[PDB]
Write a protein that binds this ligand. Structure first.
Ligand code: FMN
Ligand code: FMN
Lengths: 130, 130
C-alpha cells in the first residue's frame, strides 16, 4: 500500500492566449487536471474564472470569493503586468481550495504579450460555505 | 527558530523563445534562481544548456551528463513535441543535481510554436564526479 506516486513535485500550470479575446486556456498540465478535477477538454478554450464558480453547474461566481482580488487580477492583465494573490476556487466536485495564484505574462516577437502563464498553488481550506 | 519560508510550492520553470534561434531564455522564475544559483540577468538570452557544464566557467558539458538524453531533448524540440526525462545538471556552486525535466511547447496565434515552457525538478545526488 504505497503506490501511484508522483515523480515530480506537483506544480499547477495553465497557459492562455493573450491575443484572442478574454484569455482562453490553451494548455493545462495534468497536475491542474488532477487537483481541480477538470480534464483538459473541459477547460480548453474557456476562461479560468470558471474556477471561481463552485462546481461545473454553478452559473455565478460564489459569494465568498473576494471580488476585490478578482478585480486586481483584471487590473493586472489589462496593464500587462505580473499578478500575485490568493483567492477562493472550487474543484469540479465542489470542494473549496484557496488558490495562491501567480500570473506572469509572456512576450512574443513583436514586443507584445502573446501568452500568460498561471501557476496555481491550491491549499485546502476549512471555509464554511452554506 | 523558523522563518524566511516560501509561500508557494517550489516549482522551477523557464520560458524560451521558440522563434529566435536556439531557444534563448526569456523568463526564469525565482525558484530556478534559488535552486540553481543563477540569477535572472545571468541567464536571460542564453540557452539552458549551460546547466550541463559544471559551474559558471566550464565551457564544456560535463562528461557524466548523458549524451543520449541531451540528444532526445534535441529530437523533441525539433519534432515540436514534449520532452520528459532526467539529466545531470549543476548548480553555479558546482554541486550536482539530477534535473527531472519536462519541456512543453506552446503555440502562438498562428499554427507555429512560439515558446517552450521548461519545468525543472532538481534532486540532490551523491553521484561521484572525481
Ligand atoms: C493564465 C491565467 C490563469 C488564471 N488562473 C486562474 C485561476 O486559476 N483561478 C482563478 O480564479 N482565476 C484565474 N485567472 C483569472 C480569471 O480569468 C479572472 O477572473 C480574470 O482574469 C479577471 O477577472 P474577471 O473575469 O472578473 O474579468 C487566470 C488568468 C490567467 C490569465
Ligand atoms: C525551455 C527549455 C528549458 C530547458 N531546461 C534545461 C535544463 O534545465 N537543463 C538542461 O540540461 N537542459 C535544459 N534544456 C535543454 C537545452 O536548452 C538544449 O535544448 C539541449 O541541451 C539539447 O540541445 P544541444 O544538444 O544543442 O545542447 C532546456 C531546453 C528548453 C527549450
Amino acid at each position: 500500500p504505497v503506490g501511484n506516486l508522483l515523480h515530480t513535485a506537483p506544480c499547477s500550470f495553465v497557459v492562455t492566449d493573450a491575443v484572442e479575446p478574454d484569455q482562453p486556456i490553451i494548455y493545462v498540465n495534468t497536475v491542474f487536471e488532477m487537483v481541480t478535477g477538470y480534464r483538459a477538454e473541459e477547460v480548453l478554450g474557456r476562461n479560468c474564472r470558471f474556477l471561481q464558480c463552485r462546481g461545473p453547474f454553478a452559473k455565478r461566481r460564489h459569494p465568498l470569493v473576494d471580488s476585490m482580488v478578482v478585480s486586481e487580477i483584471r487590473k493586472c492583465i489589462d496593464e500587462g503586468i505580473e499578478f500575485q494573490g490568493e483567492l477562493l476556487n472550487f474543484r469540479k466536485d465542489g470542494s473549496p481550495l484557496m488558490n495562491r495564484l501567480r500570473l506572469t505574462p509572456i512576450y512574443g516577437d513583436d514586443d507584445t504579450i502573446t501568452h500568460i502563464i498561471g501557476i496555481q498553488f491550491f491549499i485546502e481550506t476549512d471555509i464554511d460555505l452554506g
